[PDB]
């Protein structure tokens, strides 16, 4: 039991405004879509927007902690 600096910083970043702002947009997409069947919509976009902002952030620090 040890901690992968990744999941530690993946946390930290999800706090940056950019992240939350997109994190929320998704939370919402996820909701309207999950609660409705005979759709078409998908929350990929919203997700990417998120992962995009998130990981981009992860990228700036992650390697400092890795060996």
């Amino acid at each position: 039991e040890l901690v992968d600096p990744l999941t530690t910083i993946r946390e930290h970043c999800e706090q940056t405004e950019k992240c939350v702002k997109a994190r929320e947009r998704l939370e919402l997409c996820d909701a309207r879509v999950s609660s409705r069947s005979h759709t078409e919509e998908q929350c990929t976009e919203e997700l990417f927007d998120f992962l995009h902002a998130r990981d981009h952030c992860v990228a700036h620090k992650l390697f400092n902690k890795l060996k």
Binding site: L2, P5, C29, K67
Partner: protein, 241 residues
């Protein structure tokens, strides 16, 4: 999926136009390949001798290569026989042909990873994120049975089961085998594996830039020097009158 998510830009220790590979992260990456990937992924253009002088000692490699039984022959009766591996052999295929591999991975073909780093838009940057980035499908996305979600992979339905997880193996140099720490080392290896010259390539580059700087200037002189005669020249039209 008309849409796609592109990867970020990690500052690999060797990214700079003068930065050599991390010959230690490579030795590790290797171990990661040897102990994890080499069960589905072929490395046909690399061979144990390549390691010598780069990540392992001559003695080590010999032993390394002897941990495998290869198919040599025919003998004197004409039978193919197994024999221990020599430094001159290439890394063993996990399958006898693509037809087989597919069948043992759900019709999916785990591509040889020799030039992989250079065959996917993004290189080591992409290979890293694919490895780490595995996750759950967002709202409205159904991933066919046998396929896992991965936002980084095109189509997001990748036939490769997430290959790494903390402690999945244990480096002999005493390094924290966290998911990324591995994915960093293996991605670093792939690079070396994909263009072993890399180092000597950048070293020359430097040398080139240095001669090329000096020599270009030295000639800017000799071009002007000679031309001066025509640039300083003056002429006049003196008719009869």
């Amino acid at each position: 999926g008309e849409l796609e998510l592109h990867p970020p830009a990690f500052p690999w220790s060797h990214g700079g136009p003068l930065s050599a590979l991390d010959h230690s992260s490579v030795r590790r990456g290797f171990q990661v390949y040897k102990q994890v990937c080499s069960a589905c992924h072929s490395m046909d253009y690399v061979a144990f001798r390549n390691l010598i002088g780069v990540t392992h000692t001559e003695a080590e490699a010999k032993a390394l290569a002897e941990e495998v039984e290869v198919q040599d022959g025919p003998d004197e009766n004409g039978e193919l026989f197994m024999r221990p591996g020599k430094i001159s052999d290439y890394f063993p295929k996990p399958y006898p042909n693509p037809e087989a591999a597919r069948a043992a991975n759900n019709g999916a073909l785990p591509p040889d990873l020799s030039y992989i780093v250079n065959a996917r838009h993004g290189g080591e940057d992409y290979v890293f994120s694919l490895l780490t980035g595995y996750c759950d499908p967002p709202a409205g996305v159904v991933v066919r049975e046998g396929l896992h979600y991965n936002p980084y992979f095109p189509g997001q339905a990748i036939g490769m089961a997430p290959p790494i997880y903390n402690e999945i193996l244990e480096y002999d140099d005493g390094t924290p085998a966290t998911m990324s720490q591995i994915a960093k080392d293996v991605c670093t290896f792939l690079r070396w594996a994909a263009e072993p010259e890399h180092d000597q390539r950048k070293r020359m580059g430097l040398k080139m830039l240095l001669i090329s700087a000096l020599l270009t200037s030295l000639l800017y002189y000799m071009k002007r020097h000679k031309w001066s005669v025509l640039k300083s020249r003056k002429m006049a039209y003196r008719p009869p009158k």
